[PDB]
Curated annotation (Swiss-Prot), chain C:
Pfam families: Ribosomal_L29 (PF00831). Component of the large ribosomal subunit. The ribosome is a large ribonucleoprotein complex responsible for the synthesis of proteins in the cell. One of its GO terms (biological process) is maturation of LSU-rRNA from tricistronic rRNA transcript (SSU-rRNA, 5.8S rRNA, LSU-rRNA). It comes from Oryctolagus cuniculus (Rabbit). It is found in: Cytoplasm. Disulfide bonds: none annotated. SUPFAM superfamilies: Ribosomal protein L29 (L29p) (SSF46561). Belongs to the universal ribosomal protein uL29 family. This is Large ribosomal subunit protein uL29.
Swiss-Prot record, chain D:
PANTHER family: 60S RIBOSOMAL PROTEIN L26 FAMILY MEMBER. InterPro entries: KOW, Rib_uL2_dom2, Ribosomal_uL24_CS, Ribosomal_uL24_euk/arc, Ribosomal_uL24_KOW, Translation_prot_SH3-like_sf. GO terms for molecular function: RNA binding; structural constituent of ribosome. Component of the large ribosomal subunit. The ribosome is a large ribonucleoprotein complex responsible for the synthesis of proteins in the cell. GO terms for cellular component: cytoplasm; large ribosomal subunit. Keywords: Cytoplasm, Isopeptide bond, Phosphoprotein, Ribonucleoprotein, Ribosomal protein, Ubl conjugation. The keyword Flavoprotein does not apply. Its main location: cytoplasm. It comes from the Eukaryota. This is Large ribosomal subunit protein uL24. It holds the Pfam family KOW. Residues 1-21 are annotated as: Disordered.
Curated annotation (Swiss-Prot), chain E:
It is found in: Cytoplasm. The modification N6-acetyllysine is found at residue 1. Belongs to the universal ribosomal protein uL4 family. Component of the large ribosomal subunit. May bind IPO9 with low affinity. Interacts with RBM3. Citrullinated by PADI4. It comes from Oryctolagus cuniculus (Rabbit). The chain holds residues 106 to 157 of 413 of the full protein. This is Large ribosomal subunit protein uL4. Component of the large ribosomal subunit. The ribosome is a large ribonucleoprotein complex responsible for the synthesis of proteins in the cell.
Curated annotation (Swiss-Prot), chain F:
It comes from Oryctolagus cuniculus (Rabbit). The chain holds residues 98 to 156 of 156 of the full protein. Coiled coil: none annotated. The lineage of its organism: Eukaryota, Metazoa, Chordata, Craniata, Vertebrata. Belongs to the universal ribosomal protein uL23 family. This is Large ribosomal subunit protein uL23. N-terminus is methylated by METTL11A/NTM1. GO terms for molecular function: rRNA binding; structural constituent of ribosome. Its main location: cytoplasm. The N-terminal beta-like import receptor binding (BIB) domain mediates interaction with IPO5, IPO7, KPNB1 and TNPO1. It comes from the Eukaryota.
Length: 50, 158, 122, 134, 52, 59, 86, 135
RNA sequence: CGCGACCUCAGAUCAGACGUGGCGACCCGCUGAAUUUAAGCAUAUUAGUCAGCGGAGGAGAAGAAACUAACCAGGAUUCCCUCAGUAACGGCGAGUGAACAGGGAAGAGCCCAGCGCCGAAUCCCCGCCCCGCGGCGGGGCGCGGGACAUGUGGCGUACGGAA
RNA sequence: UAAGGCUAAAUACCGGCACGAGACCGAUAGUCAACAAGUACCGUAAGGGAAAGUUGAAAAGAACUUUGAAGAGAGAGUUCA
RNA sequence: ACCCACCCGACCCGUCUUGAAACACGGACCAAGGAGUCUAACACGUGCGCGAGUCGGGGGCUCGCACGAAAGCCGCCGUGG
RNA sequence: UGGAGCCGCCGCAGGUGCAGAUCUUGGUGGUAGUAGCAAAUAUUCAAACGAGAACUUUGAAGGCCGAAGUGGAGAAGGGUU
RNA sequence: CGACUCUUAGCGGUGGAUCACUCGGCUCGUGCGUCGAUGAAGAACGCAGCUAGCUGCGAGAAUUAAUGUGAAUUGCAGGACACAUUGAUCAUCGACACUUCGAACGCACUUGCGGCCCCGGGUUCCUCCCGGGGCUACGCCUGUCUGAGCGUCGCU
């Protein structure tokens, strides 16, 4: 909005940190079932806890 | 709809009864638990009868049962008074005492005095300390039995 | 290289602080070095220094709190920290002496009419 | 049979217990027999295998009478890597092939103090049981 | 449901009758052999032994 | 710098002065959309920033 | 107009993040939640939503105090002692 | 008494339940009195109450309360039963002399409902299909 | 126009304590439907059941007869088997529906007020010492405070009790 | 013998911690959920609520040569396959 | 039993219906899933045991149950039905 | 073909046999390379990059929005665009 | 023969039935039966050398101490350590620690405003200013201090 509270800004920050894709060294771990992050949120489609 | 002959019968399954069905898959597990707990209690009350205290003889009520005789709840005060056992003490030697029992007829009374007398004969009161004062029995009747009595103590047989 | 709990226990209070400071300094430089590449060889230390820092701080708090409960062991009113936490309800049980207070009437009863060890059939 | 009513004998329970076992417990699981030679000497059937014991592989492809030194113990993978027990990958690089500890025999132990005290404890219990049986 | 009538209760004499019937045919080599038991070389069929 | 989010400019100023034996003209904080309070710290003109920068490691 | 054109003017919000329960259900005008009833001293739970009941029972979260209490109890609520040292 | 809290009348339902005016609470006023004294002084543990008068509009009562954690109560053995945590909120559970009376329990033929612990418990006993193993 | 008792009331970030929310399978107190059945429906039934509110404990509640009975009488409470789909209720329709006895599981009984006697013989908190201190206790010593005669403590409570 | 009070035990336990078992289900079953599930996702909100197990004994997961911008191939190789 | 030919025969199933190839409804195709269950009470029939009796519950005695939460026994054998 | 368990007989037990339920979940056709990719006047030439240009970029021309703008800035909403 | 169409079979696709597995459920049982102002449950935000999710933890943040164990952890790095030494790694968990909301407590929910005591820079108690620390919810009980009343008395 460009007029944020601090509460909201911090919320957004964490959401922004969560988006990154898996580190590829994770795929090489021993008992690995994970191939892709599957919790990736694109701003244009799917619109936050808000 | 009824079809040709049968008891015009009323079942009581109109409330939500399946919400309150009470199964019995416990029961074996229960039966054991009681039994362990029973054997533990014996072992705790070491030479004392497993039974409990001694209990009076007593006739049932009503015309129906009338003829039979059970164990009652506890010996009346008159019965203790006549036997000559102080009521407060009688509890301490394993004699059941209720005090709410009347005593109408003298046939039921003298029988129940006789019971207590007999009990007091065949009772083995241990002394408080290993050093032996009055009342406490001989070390003969002590070594020869610190034995529990299995089953109800002096059982009533109609 | 290794900072152990072992040795720190005996050390003087001012000496423990200098050591913490000197680790806090060493942590800073590695954090600086993590930004500017640095080297894997440096970026190990950062974990090590962190835990040695904790090892120091821990020893200090253990020493401060041991001394503290020496100081109150005897006094009736003592800080909530130093009072023994068991479980809310368990800190409202009866006192351990208060729940074995017999009434004189009950004591007299136990004196006059004690349960006796007895057996039957002899 | 097993009569102790607190053990399990339940496939799912035993396997879950196994695969989700914690390192120190895996140490015990990853044990391996001594050579008849040592079996005679120490009075011990078997021992928890360790980083640099000397060892024969008894079964499989690498089954052989050579005595390779242990290389590492991958307790996550329930496996040990052994000196010349290896295989050339596509691009020439050697790769330490896993052998399960139980399909191996310890010819030479790596004796430290603690390993020494372990062997003293196991031998003593064995001889107590023989004395009880006699 | 749990309260399916799982357990099944049998008259006591009948239970005994069965147990007598089984005993009686633990004799009879034919009935023992037919039940599969290789009892070819056994010395006597109601096989009773010393009490050591 | 990156700074702890709870900090005042007063605290930062005091920290920067304490750690690097330095002295500050002014601190000028913001918050990154990421969460880490950044701090631009103008040093007083007796001091050169590139000189301290070389001291602390960065360049 | 009742539909698509009117979805156009959903410019402003009813609820925000409640600060007890965390849900985006704190109604700004009412200044209550409607999830935990925030200002309300006691938590909101209803016996009709058994699914809702389960979504934030105890187990659900960290149980950071409660999980070490269970351990403490197990071994016997011993306090202020150590194991025999080396 | 107790008028039925429903808007206007509008106890929508079968005209058995249409009543709103002439109907009467289960507990007594004296119990309500205790319950309120109990509510207010949470630490305090309601022992018992008595009556001190009545206007048309009000009744008056006097609820005896006790600190369970005052040493003079704690250390006196004959009272220290109230300091036990089963006796938290007696009045709320229907356990003072007053709130006992609504429960409808006494020995003898004039009761039977409440021939387990309480009213609810007897119903519970009487409406359990005991379903035995062997049947 | 004071000073002093008490009574009833305030205020303290006064000293020291407690209560608040949670969980809710089981438990205690309230509150309380309507689908439904009756081949319609209004009493009835569904049901003192769901939802609603309150309060607990490891269990809760109950409990030591203002009881049963009508016998040659039983003798607190709880639980099981039975009583019994019985006595009874009911548009006497649908439907609903206990108890005593009897046999078991268990088993344990007690305390006040009052009435009286006893120099309040009682209690709480201070402070100093010795022990003990991770369930704040013992013992001693203080003209150190207060509660209390508008009644604390010992004896005693119907099974009688006191002298 | 009412209008004051306390009391263990046999009794209850679809919540909790910790175990044991099964003539049960065997991935459209069995819990909504064998998996990063009360997750993703939807709804202003109360609330709603999925799908989804399996290379091989071992990764030995295809070096190298060649066609193509590449994805893709053709040979070669690994594997008992 | 695969295909083809020819002669004769031969309307599409399910269903409700007096009457369906119907201008009556359901049905594009394939896979997996998918509906007379369990408890209680009654009645009659049949099988077995005992028989003017019969009965087993409930309880108890015998075990840490591996198989047992079985099996066995009870002046409780009959309070009681 | 597959690669690790499975069946006959005598008894017992059941969540035991599908074509239909505008049945449930998953998959696949014919329809079909069909309908369709038509609101708001407009494109053209050369070059660059590049494997590759109707669509990128640069230059040149021709056009439109025509300051109640297809321009220049905010509010709310989005949340890194 | 030609194309197309239909049928059957071979092989290949599509699709994921079947079968075989099962660190999951479902049911029955046993024992125990423990949350919270000493701050619960729940929520938030943080914390890894490379880590997004799940988990684990709390600015001592994939954990500190202690005790038991006795060489690993391992996707890669890097390292440590002398694994003849309190000693890697797991387990236990009694010591220590435990950010912010939350019954939730200085008052407010902006993360805004405060008061009162002490400490360091600031002063040289000059109050300011900055930083740190400790207090500052409501209700209620036992006492304590200060009181109020043409409430009931006494003496003056
Ligand atoms: Mg959008
Ligand atoms: Mg008995
Ligand atoms: Mg007394
Ligand atoms: Mg009605
Ligand atoms: Mg009355
Ligand atoms: Mg509460
Ligand atoms: Mg009707
Ligand atoms: Mg009808
Ligand atoms: Mg109608
Ligand atoms: Mg009714
Ligand atoms: Mg309810
Ligand atoms: Mg109770
Ligand atoms: Mg009474
Ligand atoms: Mg009775
Ligand atoms: Mg009958
Ligand atoms: Mg009724
Ligand atoms: Mg008196
Ligand atoms: Mg009571
Ligand atoms: Mg699946
Ligand atoms: Mg599947
Ligand atoms: Mg499923
Ligand atoms: Mg499958
Ligand atoms: Mg597959
Ligand atoms: Mg499959
Ligand atoms: Mg194959
Ligand atoms: Mg019809
Ligand atoms: Mg017709
Ligand atoms: Mg037809
Ligand atoms: Mg026609
Ligand atoms: Mg039709
Ligand atoms: Mg159709
Ligand atoms: Mg099928
Ligand atoms: Mg018949
Ligand atoms: Mg296989
Ligand atoms: Mg089945
Ligand atoms: Mg089908
Ligand atoms: Mg076209
Ligand atoms: Mg712009
Ligand atoms: Mg073909
Ligand atoms: Mg599938
Ligand atoms: Zn909320």
């Amino acid at each position: 909005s460009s007029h944020k509270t601090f509460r909201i800004k911090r919320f957004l920050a964490k959401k922004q940190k969560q988006n990154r894709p898996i580190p590829q060294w994770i795929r090489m771990k021993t008992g690995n079932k994970i191939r892709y992050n599957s919790k990736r949120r694109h701003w244009r489609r799917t619109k936050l806890g808000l | 709809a009824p079809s040709r002959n049968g008891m015009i019968l009323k079942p009581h399954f109109h409330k939500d009864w399946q919400r309150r069905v009470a199964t019995w898959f416990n029961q074996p597990a229960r039966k054991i638990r009681r039994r362990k707990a029973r054997q533990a209690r014996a072992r705790r009350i070491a030479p004392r009868p497993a039974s409990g205290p001694l209990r009076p003889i007593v006739r049932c009520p009503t015309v129906r049962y009338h003829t039979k005789v059970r164990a009652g709840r506890g010996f009346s005060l008159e019965e203790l008074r006549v036997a000559g056992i102080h009521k407060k003490v009688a509890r301490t030697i394993g004699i059941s005492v209720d005090p709410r029992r009347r005593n109408k007829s003298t046939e039921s009374l003298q029988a129940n005095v006789q019971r207590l007398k007999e009990y007091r004969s065949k009772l083995v009161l241990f002394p408080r300390k290993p050093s032996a004062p009055k009342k406490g029995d001989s070390s003969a009747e002590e070594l020869k039995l610190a034995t529990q009595l299995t089953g109800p103590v002096m059982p009533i047989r109609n | 290289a290794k900072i152990k709990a072992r040795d720190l226990r005996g050390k003087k209070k001012e000496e423990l602080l200098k050591q913490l400071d000197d680790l806090k300094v060493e942590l800073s430089q590695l954090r600086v070095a993590k930004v500017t590449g640095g080297a894997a060889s440096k970026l190990s230390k950062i974990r090590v220094v962190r835990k040695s820092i904790a090892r120091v701080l821990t020893v200090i708090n253990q020493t401060q709190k041991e001394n503290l409960r020496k100081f109150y062991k005897g006094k009736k009113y003592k800080p909530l920290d130093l009072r023994p936490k068991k479980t809310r309800a368990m800190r409202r049980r009866l006192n351990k002496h208060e729940e074995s207070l017999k009434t004189k009437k009950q004591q007299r009863k136990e004196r006059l009419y004690p349960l006796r060890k007895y057996a039957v059939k002899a | 049979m097993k009569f102790n009513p607190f053990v399990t004998s339940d496939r799912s329970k035993n396997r879950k217990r196994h695969f989700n076992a914690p390192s120190h417990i895996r140490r015990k699981i990853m044990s391996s027999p001594l050579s008849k030679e040592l079996r005679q000497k120490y009075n011990v059937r078997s021992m928890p295998i360790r980083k640099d014991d000397e060892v024969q592989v008894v079964r499989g492809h690498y089954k052989g009478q050579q005595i390779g030194k242990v290389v590492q113990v991958y307790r996550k993978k329930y496996v040990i890597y052994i000196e010349r027990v290896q295989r050339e990958k596509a691009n020439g690089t050697t790769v330490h092939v896993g052998i399960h500890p139980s399909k191996v025999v310890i010819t030479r132990l790596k004796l430290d103090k603690d390993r020494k005290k372990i062997l003293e404890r196991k031998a003593k219990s064995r001889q107590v049981g023989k004395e009880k049986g006699k | 449901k749990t309260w399916r009538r799982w357990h099944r209760r049998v008259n006591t004499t009948q239970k005994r009758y069965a147990i007598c019937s089984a005993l009686a045919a633990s004799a009879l080599p034919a009935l023992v052999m037919s039940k599969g038991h290789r009892i070819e070389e056994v010395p006597e069929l109601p096989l009773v032994v010393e009490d050591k | 710098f990156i700074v702890d989010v709870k900090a005042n400019k007063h605290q930062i100023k005091q920290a920067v002065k304490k750690l690097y034996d330095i002295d500050v003209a002014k601190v000028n904080t913001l918050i990154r959309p990421d969460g880490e309070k950044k701090a631009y710290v103008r040093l007083a003109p007796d001091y050169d920033a590139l000189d301290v920068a070389n001291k602390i490691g960065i360049i | 107009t009742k539909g698509t054109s009117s979805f156009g003017k959903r410019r402003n919000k009813t609820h925000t993040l409640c600060r007890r329960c965390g849900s985006k259900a704190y109604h700004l005008q009412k200044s209550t939640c409607g999830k935990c009833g925030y200002p309300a001293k006691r938590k909101r739970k209803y016996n009709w939503s058994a699914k809702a009941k389960r979504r934030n029972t105890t187990g659900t979260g960290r149980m950071r105090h409660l999980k070490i209490v269970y351990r403490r109890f197990r071994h016997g609520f011993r306090e202020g002692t150590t194991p025999k040292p080396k | 008494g107790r008028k039925r809290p429903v808007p206007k009348g509008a106890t929508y339902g079968k005209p058995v339940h249409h009543g709103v005016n002439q109907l009467k609470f289960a507990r007594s006023l004296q119990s309500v009195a205790e319950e309120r004294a109990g509510r207010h002084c949470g630490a305090l543990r309601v022992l018992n109450s008595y009556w001190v008068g009545e206007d048309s509009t009000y009744k008056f009562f006097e609820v005896i309360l006790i600190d369970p954690f005052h040493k003079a109560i704690r250390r006196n053995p004959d009272t220290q039963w109230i300091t036990k945590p089963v006796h938290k909120h007696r009045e709320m559970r229907g356990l003072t002399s007053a709130g006992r009376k609504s429960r409808g329990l006494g020995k003898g033929h004039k009761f039977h409902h409440t021939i387990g612990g309480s009213r609810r418990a007897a119903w519970r006993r009487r409406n359990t299909l005991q379903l035995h193993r062997y049947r």
